[PDB]
Ligand binder design. Structure first.
Ligand code: HEM
Ligand SMILES: CC1(C)[C@@H]2CC[C@@]1(C)C(=O)C2
Ligand SMILES: [K+]
Length: 405
């Protein structure tokens, strides 16, 4: 239900949006969030859902808030409040100045140089998975590709058993789209329960995996503590297991449904990177936020100290004030404007990994399985949260239309 309105919040700003179960979910998750950008809805509304919080509805406000960490702190970045208070991943839960020393370490485990070195494993895995599926004439896209392809790479990188995937993924999802059986805090603590012994053990006898590197790293010239290492490793796991995994299904769903757009990429493969980018805008999927460090007036609205404000990364590129005809996918879009990977000082650090992962998928999939569709009569269900996703994507094709090598 709906938390009672705080004395400081005027009635005309109330729009009761639930980010975990939005009213128009059936029409598509990006579409359900876009109801916040209809003509009679303010730039800045208060929802009585999920304990009560603000939502900036437009790119300009979202951008401004992300830049202004002095008023909009990451210390409590998740809705509901219990989740933001329990949230303590590094660097995400820290503001500058302290946040920054940690980014460099994180970079050492997921940035460009790590990515260049993983690139042949990544390509190899995409081809392997796709060739395996090709002759079946069908798949459950989420289980058979969108999960194993990003996730086996991350486990490879982190030096963790593939048999640990289901427990890890379960826990991760409880932190972005809870089924209601675990609080944020309960899942985080269970994530820590798993990491703690491994981090110590990798501090005792370091390897060349990501956990060893974080575990034995330095932070602006001094050693990382055990507790900090854990709070960093947890964030990497979440990003490894619940970002690209969901993005791929939005993109594949779209491609299953538009043969023209497939044909465009088959016919002009040089368009793939630009296509990646337009799809990143279109099927944007993250929505975290910040907390007010003081009473502050912002675009003519009075915010109180401790108020939570959701600043949906998803919404900036769907905003018609940033991109005309924003629901329309155009790979030749002259100026693709979005905040898919964030804005300000917390700007995504796995974005090179993610764009490689996307681009490789587009290429290797259309190469082998050019014609394909949604299974007969399947109604694709989406799910909303910190990171939205797709419940299931059953796909079909005629193997005769496909090409191996
Ligand atoms: C489609 C893919 C992805 C999207 C849309 C995405 C989105 C984002 C967003 C919106 C933020 C900012 C959070 C905030 O400002 O509070 C962020 C930060 C971050 N992301 Fe990504 N992400 C993606 C893939 C990945 C991957 C694969 C990783 C690998 C681990 C990753 C690692 C991180 C890390 C470590 C941060 C924290 C940086 C900081 O707080 O300074 N992301 N990401
Ligand atoms: C919003 C995010 C996608 C960003 C990386 C993982 C995530 C869930 C975070 O906790 C920070
Ligand atoms: K916190």
């Amino acid at each position: 239900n709906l938390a009672p309105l705080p004395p400081h919040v005027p009635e005309h700003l109330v729009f009761d949006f639930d980010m975990y179960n939005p009213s128009n979910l059936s029409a598509g998750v990006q579409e359900a969030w876009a109801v916040l950008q209809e003509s009679n809805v303010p730039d800045l509304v208060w929802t009585r859902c999920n304990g009560g919080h603000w939502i900036a509805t437009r790119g300009q406000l979202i951008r401004e808030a992300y830049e202004d960490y002095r008023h909009f702190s990451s210390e409590c970045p998740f809705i509901p409040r219990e989740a933001g208070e329990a949230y303590d991943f590094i660097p995400t839960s820290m503001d500058p100045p302290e946040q920054r020393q940690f980014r460099a370490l994180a970079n050492q485990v997921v940035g460009m140089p790590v990515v260049d070195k993983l690139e042949n494993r990544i390509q190899e895995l995409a081809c392997s998975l796709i060739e395996s599926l090709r002759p079946q004439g069908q798949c459950n896209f989420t289980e058979d590709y969108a999960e194993p392809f990003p996730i086996r790479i991350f486990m490879l990188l982190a030096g963790l058993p593939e048999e640990d995937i289901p427990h890890l993924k379960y826990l991760t999802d409880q932190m972005t789209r809870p089924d209601g059986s675990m609080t944020f805090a309960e899942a985080k603590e269970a994530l820590y329960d798993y990491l703690i012994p491994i981090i110590e053990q990798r501090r005792q006898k370091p390897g060349t995996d990501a956990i060893s590197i974080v575990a034995n790293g330095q932070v602006n010239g001094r050693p990382i503590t055990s507790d900090e290492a854990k709070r960093m490793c947890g964030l990497l796991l979440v990003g490894g297991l619940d970002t690209v995994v969901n993005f791929l299904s939005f993109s594949m769903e779209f491609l299953a449904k538009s043969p023209e757009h497939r044909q465009e990429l088959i016919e002009r493969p040089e368009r793939i990177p630009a296509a990646c980018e337009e799809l990143l805008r279109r099927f944007s999927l993250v929505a975290d936020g910040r907390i007010l460090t003081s009473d502050y007036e912002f675009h003519g609205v009075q915010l109180k100290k401790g108020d939570q404000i959701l600043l949906p990364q998803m919404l900036s590129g769907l905003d018609e004030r940033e991109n005309a005809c924003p629901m329309h996918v155009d790979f030749s879009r002259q100026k693709v404007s979005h905040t898919t990977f964030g804005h300000g000082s917390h700007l995504x650090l796995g974005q090179h990994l993610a764009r490689l992962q996307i681009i490789v998928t587009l290429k290797e999939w259309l190469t082998r399985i050019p014609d394909f569709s949604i299974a007969p009569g399947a109604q694709i269900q989406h799910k909303s949260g910190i990171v939205s996703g797709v419940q299931a994507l059953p796909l079909v094709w005629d193997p005769a239309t496909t090409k191996a090598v």
